[PDB]
């Protein structure tokens with residue numbers, strides 16, 4: 001009963017691709033990316049949320065290490081605990097570790113909960129992308145082919161299921177008989193297909209795309 005193909009960009013739920021630079025904050029970009037879609041669905045407004053807010057404030061208590069890495073799930077937990085996250089406009093991205101400067105005056109979103117999906121279940125991931133929205137995931141990006149990707153459905157024979165880079169699944173589809181996940185990266189427009197990579201789908205959890213998926217929600221109230 002699920003759609004054969006999904007692309008949440010078609011519903012105006014995905015902000016512009018960002019550029020993380022030399023700061024290892026893909027976990028933070030993946031987290032705000034997922035929440036940006038839920039905020040758009042609830043309020044009608046598409047607003048980039050502050051990845052920097054996560055880097056500076058969702059730190060040791062959440063197991064995160066700022067520009068040295070982190071988790072989307074504990075980023076969501078911080079937003080829940082903190083009762084908000086600032087807009088990127090008010091708290092812009094500097095690709096550096098800074099003191100926490102969260103200001104509730106510029107809160108642009110909240111988070112009520114988040115859900116984790118079972119490891120390696122690409123069918124379950126498909127259902128969530130179709131029925132809930134863009135899903136935060138990790139992938140194994142430690143391959144020159146990933147950095148060098150330009151177009152088409154990416155398949156890396158030496159990929160593993162051990163994730164190391166946070167990204168956002170904003171959809172899925174098929175290209176000339178190859179199924180793919182539509183993945184928003186945080187390496188700017190010049191990476192891949194305008195900042196996106198289409199990654200092999202239903203090929204045994206390729207590059208760990210379904211190893212650790214999660215997504216937040218903003219509930220009425």
Ligand SMILES: CC(C)=CC(=O)NCc1cc(-c2nn(CCCN(C)C)c3c2CN(C(=O)CC2CCNCC2)CC3)ccc1C(F)(F)F
Nearest residue numbers: 027063064065068069070071137138162163164165166212
């Ligand atoms: C340096 C740092 C602070 C964080 C980090 O590494 N982030 C990368 C990252 C990690 C995870 C992640 N989630 N889980 C669930 C439990 C998580 N709790 C504890 C919160 C885990 C991981 C990583 N993992 C594994 O891969 C398992 C294997 C790791 C190396 N062989 C042995 C097992 C452990 C459990 C998911 C997404 C991302 C993403 F997207 F950012 F790439």
